[PDB]
Amino acid sequence: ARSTNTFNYATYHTLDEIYDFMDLLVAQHPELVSKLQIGRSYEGRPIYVLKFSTGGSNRPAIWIDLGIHSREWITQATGVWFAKKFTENYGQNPSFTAILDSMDIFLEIVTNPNGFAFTHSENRLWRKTRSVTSSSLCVGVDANRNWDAGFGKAGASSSPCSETYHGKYANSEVEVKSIVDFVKNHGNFKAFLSIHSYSQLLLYPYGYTTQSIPDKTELNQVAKSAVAALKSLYGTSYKYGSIITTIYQASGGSIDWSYNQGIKYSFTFELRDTGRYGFLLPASQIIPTAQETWLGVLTIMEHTVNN
Ligand SMILES: *C[C@H](Cc1ccccc1)C(=O)O
Ligand SMILES: [Zn+2]
């Protein structure tokens, strides 16, 4: 409505509603947050990032992106809630004020604008981008199989109509390239988190290879504590481990590419639930879900600022 304070956070919103909300949030807290357009989607929709910052140099940053798979509605909704929480706790929660006084947070609420819009008017279960320009009748690419980390290897499909089709070449999707260029140009991101649904899992690299990352013992300990934190509010249980060891071999994922850029704290959360609702989580589960990942995400940020 006419305030983020009167915005309903326990209901699923449309693309316009989410873009509207960003403008109101900035309008209310211009000192702490600004909106940045990092590119345009296949269909020409602007792609935005909300940058939270108290100021400073090319400060160490924390990247978070939600909704790369459009049907996972619990994610873009969680992002909306996260944005408001960042403005509420600054100046209030000790640990969070510490992180924001030394680091910036970049939050991409609707990473896949076209697919999201499509889930609101055409197919609620659409999860890919909406790119065409190919030798097929089927459209789109699975934006989480499109990164340059083991691209084209076992773990993604080469079938255009496939829901996990990887695309013509690594980073062919503008939605993927928009993030890569922004993160690389910056050259100072210390954490890269991707948020999906469902199956309640905290993942770290890799997905495209059995090789164990050198930072495994640490990232494993970071995941272990993050899972314990999250579980504390309602008892929601997550399993954690490498992508390949605990979900499946998946190539061309964002966290493997990011970790390969040298961004150490690379993780992906697969939110609620484990299958009863899957993608159609009840609106009543939004704030509760948002509340708990906040604990697991804050743990990871705490580790990054301190380690
Ligand atoms: C979230 C789920 C598993 C995953 C995570 C990170 C990289 C690749 C795959 C997915 O299918 O996107
Ligand atoms: Zn997903």
Short mmCIF file of C-alpha atoms and ligand atoms in Angstrom, two decimals:
data_model
loop_
_atom_site.label_atom_id
_atom_site.label_comp_id
_atom_site.label_asym_id
_atom_site.label_seq_id
_atom_site.Cartn_x
_atom_site.Cartn_y
_atom_site.Cartn_z
CA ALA A 1 0.00 0.00 0.00
CA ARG A 2 1.42 3.43 0.96
CA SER A 3 4.16 2.00 3.19
CA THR A 4 6.31 -1.12 3.54
CA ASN A 5 4.95 -1.14 7.10
CA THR A 6 1.50 -1.84 5.66
CA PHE A 7 2.80 -4.22 2.99
CA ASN A 8 1.49 -7.76 3.49
CA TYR A 9 4.42 -10.15 3.95
CA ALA A 10 2.25 -13.25 4.45
CA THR A 11 0.84 -13.38 0.93
CA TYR A 12 2.43 -14.07 -2.47
CA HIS A 13 3.01 -11.05 -4.66
CA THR A 14 3.31 -10.31 -8.37
CA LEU A 15 6.33 -8.93 -10.20
CA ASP A 16 4.93 -5.39 -10.19
CA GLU A 17 4.17 -5.63 -6.50
CA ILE A 18 7.76 -6.68 -5.75
CA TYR A 19 9.30 -3.96 -7.96
CA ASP A 20 6.89 -1.41 -6.37
CA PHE A 21 7.97 -2.52 -2.90
CA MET A 22 11.67 -1.94 -3.67
CA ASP A 23 10.94 1.70 -4.52
CA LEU A 24 9.03 2.20 -1.27
CA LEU A 25 11.78 0.58 0.77
CA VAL A 26 14.45 2.86 -0.76
CA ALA A 27 12.12 5.87 -0.41
CA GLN A 28 11.93 5.12 3.32
CA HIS A 29 15.58 4.24 4.03
CA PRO A 30 17.70 6.01 1.37
CA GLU A 31 20.67 6.20 3.74
CA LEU A 32 20.99 2.40 3.95
CA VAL A 33 19.61 1.02 0.65
CA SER A 34 19.69 1.85 -3.07
CA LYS A 35 18.33 -0.05 -6.09
CA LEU A 36 20.69 -0.89 -8.94
CA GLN A 37 19.69 -2.17 -12.39
CA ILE A 38 22.28 -4.74 -13.43
CA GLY A 39 20.73 -5.67 -16.75
CA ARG A 40 17.53 -6.54 -18.60
CA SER A 41 15.84 -9.93 -18.92
CA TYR A 42 15.35 -11.73 -22.25
CA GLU A 43 12.01 -9.96 -22.64
CA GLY A 44 13.44 -6.58 -21.71
CA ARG A 45 12.42 -6.37 -18.04
CA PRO A 46 14.91 -4.50 -15.89
CA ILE A 47 16.82 -6.75 -13.49
CA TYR A 48 17.42 -5.07 -10.13
CA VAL A 49 19.66 -5.56 -7.11
CA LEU A 50 19.04 -3.97 -3.70
CA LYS A 51 22.36 -2.81 -2.25
CA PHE A 52 22.51 -2.37 1.51
CA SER A 53 25.46 -0.27 2.69
CA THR A 54 26.49 2.16 5.39
CA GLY A 55 29.18 3.58 3.07
CA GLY A 56 32.90 3.06 2.54
CA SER A 57 35.39 1.76 -0.04
CA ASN A 58 34.90 -1.28 -2.30
CA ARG A 59 33.77 -2.96 0.93
CA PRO A 60 33.79 -6.78 1.33
CA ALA A 61 30.41 -7.89 0.06
CA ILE A 62 27.79 -10.56 0.56
CA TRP A 63 25.79 -11.65 -2.48
CA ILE A 64 22.36 -13.22 -2.12
CA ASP A 65 20.07 -14.15 -4.96
CA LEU A 66 16.56 -15.57 -4.90
CA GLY A 67 14.12 -16.95 -7.43
CA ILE A 68 16.49 -18.05 -10.19
CA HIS A 69 13.91 -20.85 -10.64
CA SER A 70 10.66 -18.84 -10.92
CA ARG A 71 8.19 -21.37 -9.52
CA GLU A 72 9.97 -21.51 -6.15
CA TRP A 73 7.75 -18.72 -4.84
CA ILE A 74 8.81 -19.15 -1.22
CA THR A 75 12.16 -17.68 -2.25
CA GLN A 76 11.21 -14.32 -3.81
CA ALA A 77 8.79 -13.91 -0.89
CA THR A 78 11.60 -14.68 1.59
CA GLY A 79 13.73 -12.03 -0.16
CA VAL A 80 11.01 -9.41 0.24
CA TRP A 81 10.93 -10.17 3.97
CA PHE A 82 14.75 -10.16 4.16
CA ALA A 83 14.90 -6.67 2.65
CA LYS A 84 12.56 -5.29 5.31
CA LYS A 85 14.42 -7.13 8.10
CA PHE A 86 17.76 -5.59 7.03
CA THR A 87 16.22 -2.11 7.49
CA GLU A 88 14.65 -3.05 10.82
CA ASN A 89 17.63 -4.63 12.57
CA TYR A 90 20.28 -2.14 11.57
CA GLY A 91 20.90 -0.12 14.72
CA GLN A 92 18.96 -2.78 16.69
CA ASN A 93 20.62 -6.24 16.60
CA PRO A 94 24.32 -6.10 17.68
CA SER A 95 25.68 -8.75 15.35
CA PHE A 96 23.78 -7.53 12.33
CA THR A 97 24.83 -3.91 12.89
CA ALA A 98 28.43 -5.16 13.11
CA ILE A 99 28.19 -6.92 9.73
CA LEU A 100 26.55 -3.94 8.03
CA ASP A 101 29.04 -1.52 9.51
CA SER A 102 31.87 -3.36 7.75
CA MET A 103 30.25 -5.11 4.75
CA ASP A 104 27.62 -4.43 2.08
CA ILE A 105 24.84 -6.84 1.20
CA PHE A 106 23.56 -7.28 -2.36
CA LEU A 107 20.10 -8.85 -2.61
CA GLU A 108 18.55 -9.92 -5.93
CA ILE A 109 14.88 -10.61 -5.12
CA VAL A 110 13.60 -11.70 -8.53
CA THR A 111 16.61 -13.11 -10.38
CA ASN A 112 14.42 -14.50 -13.19
CA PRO A 113 11.86 -11.68 -13.99
CA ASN A 114 10.40 -13.26 -17.16
CA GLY A 115 9.85 -16.68 -15.64
CA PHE A 116 8.25 -15.11 -12.54
CA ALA A 117 5.80 -13.06 -14.60
CA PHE A 118 5.05 -16.24 -16.56
CA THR A 119 4.23 -18.13 -13.33
CA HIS A 120 1.59 -15.50 -12.56
CA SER A 121 -0.27 -15.55 -15.83
CA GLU A 122 0.50 -18.70 -17.71
CA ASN A 123 2.21 -21.61 -15.96
CA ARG A 124 2.64 -21.61 -12.17
CA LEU A 125 5.22 -24.40 -12.49
CA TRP A 126 7.45 -22.71 -15.06
CA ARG A 127 10.98 -22.62 -13.73
CA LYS A 128 13.29 -21.75 -16.61
CA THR A 129 14.10 -18.44 -18.31
CA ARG A 130 11.98 -17.46 -21.35
CA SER A 131 14.75 -17.21 -23.97
CA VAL A 132 14.02 -18.36 -27.53
CA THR A 133 16.42 -17.73 -30.50
CA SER A 134 17.29 -21.42 -31.08
CA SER A 135 16.54 -24.50 -33.23
CA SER A 136 13.51 -25.52 -31.15
CA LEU A 137 9.84 -24.96 -30.30
CA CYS A 138 10.64 -25.07 -26.60
CA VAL A 139 11.78 -21.97 -24.83
CA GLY A 140 14.03 -21.24 -21.89
CA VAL A 141 17.06 -22.51 -20.07
CA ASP A 142 17.54 -23.75 -16.52
CA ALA A 143 19.46 -20.74 -15.16
CA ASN A 144 21.02 -22.88 -12.41
CA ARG A 145 22.61 -25.24 -14.97
CA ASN A 146 23.93 -22.38 -17.13
CA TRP A 147 27.07 -21.29 -15.25
CA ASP A 148 30.66 -21.89 -16.34
CA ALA A 149 31.53 -24.57 -13.80
CA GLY A 150 31.69 -27.96 -15.42
CA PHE A 151 29.34 -26.60 -18.11
CA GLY A 152 27.72 -29.26 -20.30
CA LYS A 153 29.03 -32.09 -18.13
CA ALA A 154 26.88 -34.82 -16.58
CA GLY A 155 24.22 -33.24 -14.36
CA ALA A 156 22.20 -31.12 -16.81
CA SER A 157 20.34 -31.90 -20.02
CA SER A 158 21.03 -30.97 -23.57
CA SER A 159 17.32 -31.41 -24.49
CA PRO A 160 15.78 -27.93 -25.19
CA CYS A 161 12.34 -28.92 -23.79
CA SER A 162 13.98 -30.38 -20.69
CA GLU A 163 13.27 -28.53 -17.44
CA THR A 164 17.01 -28.76 -16.70
CA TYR A 165 18.31 -27.82 -20.16
CA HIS A 166 21.74 -26.12 -19.78
CA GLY A 167 21.71 -23.84 -22.84
CA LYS A 168 23.93 -23.35 -25.89
CA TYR A 169 27.07 -22.29 -24.04
CA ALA A 170 28.13 -21.26 -20.52
CA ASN A 171 26.53 -17.98 -19.44
CA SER A 172 24.44 -17.70 -22.60
CA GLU A 173 21.51 -16.46 -20.49
CA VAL A 174 21.48 -12.71 -19.89
CA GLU A 175 20.10 -13.32 -16.40
CA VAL A 176 23.22 -15.37 -15.57
CA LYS A 177 25.63 -13.01 -17.37
CA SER A 178 24.14 -9.98 -15.48
CA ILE A 179 25.25 -11.47 -12.15
CA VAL A 180 28.64 -12.76 -13.37
CA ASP A 181 29.66 -9.40 -14.80
CA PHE A 182 28.55 -7.55 -11.66
CA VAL A 183 30.23 -9.93 -9.23
CA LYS A 184 33.46 -10.13 -11.27
CA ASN A 185 33.73 -6.36 -11.88
CA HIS A 186 33.32 -5.87 -8.12
CA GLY A 187 36.11 -8.32 -7.31
CA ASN A 188 35.48 -8.23 -3.55
CA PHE A 189 32.53 -10.50 -2.74
CA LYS A 190 33.34 -12.77 0.25
CA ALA A 191 30.08 -14.76 0.30
CA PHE A 192 27.75 -15.87 -2.51
CA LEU A 193 24.44 -17.40 -1.40
CA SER A 194 21.73 -18.75 -3.68
CA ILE A 195 18.24 -19.48 -2.35
CA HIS A 196 15.94 -22.13 -3.83
CA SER A 197 13.22 -24.63 -2.74
CA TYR A 198 12.35 -27.40 -1.77
CA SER A 199 13.82 -30.37 0.29
CA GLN A 200 15.44 -28.52 3.20
CA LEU A 201 19.15 -28.71 2.38
CA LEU A 202 22.18 -26.52 3.05
CA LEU A 203 24.67 -27.12 0.24
CA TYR A 204 28.28 -26.20 -0.52
CA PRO A 205 30.40 -27.06 -3.59
CA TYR A 206 30.64 -29.08 -5.59
CA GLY A 207 27.82 -30.42 -7.71
CA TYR A 208 29.76 -31.02 -10.95
CA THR A 209 32.59 -33.09 -9.46
CA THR A 210 33.38 -35.62 -6.73
CA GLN A 211 36.57 -33.73 -5.92
CA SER A 212 36.43 -32.33 -2.38
CA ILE A 213 37.03 -28.60 -2.11
CA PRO A 214 40.07 -27.59 -0.02
CA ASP A 215 37.85 -25.52 2.32
CA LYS A 216 35.58 -28.48 3.04
CA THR A 217 36.24 -28.85 6.79
CA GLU A 218 35.45 -25.18 7.35
CA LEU A 219 32.46 -24.85 5.01
CA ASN A 220 31.16 -28.09 6.51
CA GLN A 221 31.45 -26.60 10.01
CA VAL A 222 29.85 -23.36 8.78
CA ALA A 223 26.93 -25.40 7.35
CA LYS A 224 26.60 -27.50 10.51
CA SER A 225 26.20 -24.41 12.72
CA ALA A 226 23.89 -22.68 10.22
CA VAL A 227 21.58 -25.72 10.24
CA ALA A 228 21.56 -25.81 14.04
CA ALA A 229 20.67 -22.09 14.14
CA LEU A 230 17.82 -22.33 11.62
CA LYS A 231 16.35 -25.35 13.44
CA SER A 232 16.10 -23.40 16.72
CA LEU A 233 12.89 -21.48 16.02
CA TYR A 234 10.48 -24.18 14.92
CA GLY A 235 12.48 -27.40 14.71
CA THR A 236 12.75 -27.44 10.89
CA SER A 237 15.40 -30.05 10.00
CA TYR A 238 17.90 -29.56 7.21
CA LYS A 239 20.57 -31.92 5.93
CA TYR A 240 23.86 -30.34 4.79
CA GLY A 241 26.82 -31.38 2.68
CA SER A 242 28.22 -31.03 -0.82
CA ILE A 243 25.74 -30.73 -3.69
CA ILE A 244 26.90 -33.99 -5.28
CA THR A 245 27.03 -35.98 -2.01
CA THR A 246 23.58 -34.95 -0.89
CA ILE A 247 21.26 -34.10 -3.78
CA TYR A 248 22.85 -35.30 -7.01
CA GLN A 249 25.52 -34.54 -9.62
CA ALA A 250 24.45 -31.22 -11.14
CA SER A 251 26.67 -29.25 -13.53
CA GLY A 252 26.65 -25.54 -14.35
CA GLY A 253 25.49 -24.36 -10.92
CA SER A 254 26.10 -20.89 -9.48
CA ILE A 255 27.85 -21.85 -6.23
CA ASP A 256 30.45 -23.98 -8.01
CA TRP A 257 31.28 -21.11 -10.37
CA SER A 258 31.39 -18.62 -7.46
CA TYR A 259 33.61 -20.86 -5.36
CA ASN A 260 35.79 -21.20 -8.46
CA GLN A 261 36.01 -17.39 -8.63
CA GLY A 262 37.60 -17.69 -5.20
CA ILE A 263 34.46 -16.65 -3.29
CA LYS A 264 34.89 -18.94 -0.29
CA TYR A 265 31.56 -18.89 1.49
CA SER A 266 29.54 -20.31 -1.38
CA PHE A 267 26.24 -21.96 -0.37
CA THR A 268 22.71 -22.72 -1.61
CA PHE A 269 19.65 -23.15 0.63
CA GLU A 270 16.79 -25.39 -0.63
CA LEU A 271 13.89 -24.14 1.54
CA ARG A 272 10.72 -25.80 2.92
CA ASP A 273 9.35 -28.34 2.60
CA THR A 274 10.36 -31.95 1.74
CA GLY A 275 7.51 -32.79 -0.60
CA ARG A 276 4.01 -32.42 0.85
CA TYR A 277 3.52 -29.08 -0.93
CA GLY A 278 6.76 -28.77 -2.82
CA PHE A 279 6.49 -25.58 -4.88
CA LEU A 280 3.02 -24.64 -3.67
CA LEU A 281 3.89 -23.86 -0.04
CA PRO A 282 0.92 -22.32 1.84
CA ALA A 283 1.11 -18.52 2.26
CA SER A 284 0.96 -19.18 6.01
CA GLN A 285 4.43 -20.76 5.72
CA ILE A 286 6.10 -17.61 4.35
CA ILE A 287 7.00 -15.57 7.42
CA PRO A 288 7.93 -18.73 9.42
CA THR A 289 10.24 -19.93 6.62
CA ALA A 290 11.70 -16.43 6.26
CA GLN A 291 12.29 -16.18 10.00
CA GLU A 292 14.32 -19.41 10.18
CA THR A 293 16.67 -18.99 7.13
CA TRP A 294 17.40 -15.59 8.50
CA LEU A 295 19.08 -17.40 11.41
CA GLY A 296 21.04 -19.72 9.12
CA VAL A 297 22.03 -16.93 6.74
CA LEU A 298 23.08 -14.59 9.60
CA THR A 299 25.30 -17.39 10.94
CA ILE A 300 27.11 -17.60 7.61
CA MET A 301 27.48 -13.81 7.43
CA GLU A 302 28.82 -13.83 11.00
CA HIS A 303 31.42 -16.35 10.00
CA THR A 304 32.38 -14.30 6.95
CA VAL A 305 32.87 -11.07 8.89
CA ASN A 306 34.85 -12.87 11.62
CA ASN A 307 36.67 -15.45 9.45
C1 LIG B 1 18.83 -26.29 -5.65
C2 LIG B 1 19.07 -27.52 -6.53
C3 LIG B 1 20.40 -28.24 -6.25
C4 LIG B 1 21.62 -27.48 -6.71
C5 LIG B 1 22.23 -26.52 -5.90
C6 LIG B 1 23.35 -25.81 -6.34
C7 LIG B 1 23.88 -26.06 -7.60
C8 LIG B 1 23.29 -27.03 -8.42
C9 LIG B 1 22.17 -27.73 -7.97
C10 LIG B 1 18.95 -27.19 -8.02
O1 LIG B 1 18.57 -28.10 -8.77
O2 LIG B 1 19.14 -26.02 -8.44
ZN ZN B 2 15.69 -24.12 -7.60
#
